[PDB]
């Protein structure tokens, strides 16, 4: 079978971030959000040198509008809501 | 000033899988692995319809060779070792 393993390099990679209840309202979170999750960029990957974690050099903040759908003990309510996404744009292997 | 959110669609996306101790040896976890992690494909993303999770239609197994470095008490030993990677190649929203 086998073939030779390639290290996951330290770079920015598309990930899926779920938009949680706590991010808009903790108080008895009896409501929903659309969309329920968005793509983001994060650093991930391993480092060649010993004792260097993969970490972000440059993070971009990106606010985005969603909808909050409150089950108002009976009837849907559609409010707009903004959430701020933290995108990584570059990575470096940096010391512990 | 905000802009309009785009749903993360149900598709295959490059992810980073860490190669753990238990995958080669639970009994003695006094050793290391190179590389420490590899890229894989997995399904991720949300579904448009109600009560449909994003899940894989086709998974590919892919065996890969790494090195196990045993601290044999004071002295390194380099053994080759194969690990099997599970790659997703297509996704569907399923109940």
């Amino acid at each position, epitope marked *: 079978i086998a073939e030779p393993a390639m290290i996951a390099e330290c770079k920015t990679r598309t990930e899926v971030f779920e938009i949680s209840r706590r991010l808009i309202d903790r108080t008895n979170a009896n409501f929903l959000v659309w969309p329920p999750c968005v793509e983001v960029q994060r650093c991930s990957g391993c480092c*060649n040198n*010993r004792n260097v974690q993969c970490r972000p050099t440059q993070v971009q903040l990106r606010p985005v509008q969603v909808r909050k759908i409150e089950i108002v003990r009976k009837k849907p309510i559609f409010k707009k809501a903004t959430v701020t996404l933290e995108d990584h744009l570059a990575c470096k292997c940096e010391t512990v | 000033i905000a802009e309009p959110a785009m749903i993360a669609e149900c598709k295959t996306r490059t992810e980073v899988f860490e190669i753990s101790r238990r995958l080669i040896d639970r009994t003695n976890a006094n050793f290391l692995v*190179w590389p420490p992690c590899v890229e894989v494909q997995r399904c991720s993303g949300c579904c448009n319809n109600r009560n449909v999770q994003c899940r894989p239609t086709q998974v590919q197994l892919r065996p890969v060779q790494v090195r196990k470095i045993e601290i044999v008490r004071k*002295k390194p030993i380099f053994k080759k070792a194969t690990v099997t990677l599970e790659d997703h190649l297509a996704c569907k929203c399923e109940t």
Partner: antibody
Amino acid sequence: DLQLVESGGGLVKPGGSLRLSCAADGWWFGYTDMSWVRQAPGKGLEWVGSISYKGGSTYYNTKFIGRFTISRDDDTNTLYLQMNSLRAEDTAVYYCARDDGYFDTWGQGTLVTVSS
Amino acid sequence: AIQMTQSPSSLSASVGDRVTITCHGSYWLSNYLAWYQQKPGKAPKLLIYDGKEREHGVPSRFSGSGSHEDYTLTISSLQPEDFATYYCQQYRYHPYTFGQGTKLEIKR
């Protein structure tokens, strides 16, 4: 497989001095002995020397004991060969290699040409 | 040092032939021997190590044997892509020592 890349070679006047470096992808480098091996144009392979895991020890081929120093940087995953009082004899491709008795990983090599 | 004596210095062999290359040491080696193939221009590739162990990804036809002083690489069914120069290497005692090499030509 494991990567190794030698550099530091080229053209050098006789009597001169030169440092070769050999760089390795990956921290595995810190966990292995490392040898240098040379080979003159159209001739056989010749062990140059090795260095132990932690730096503990160095080992050399007699022909070379006076002239060459093997040094190792466990942070950069780099292996180094210091070469002094060079002569035509030393015109060779110089290999980096992973010493475990039996050298399972090789650089491509770096050509040293000794000539004025 | 221990002197490695490979034989023969050079040879031609037709496609399909069985071929043997022999390496002889000045002392008893106990399988602290390995075999390399090396194409023109390129680094050596490890074929056999510990006298008889094949390396992952080395074709079935390459075969290691020997004990004590006397060791053998055997290429069973010679393939045109096997043209190379082959070396043995002792590693029972420092300094490491190699053979003078065997330059293998394919004959046709």
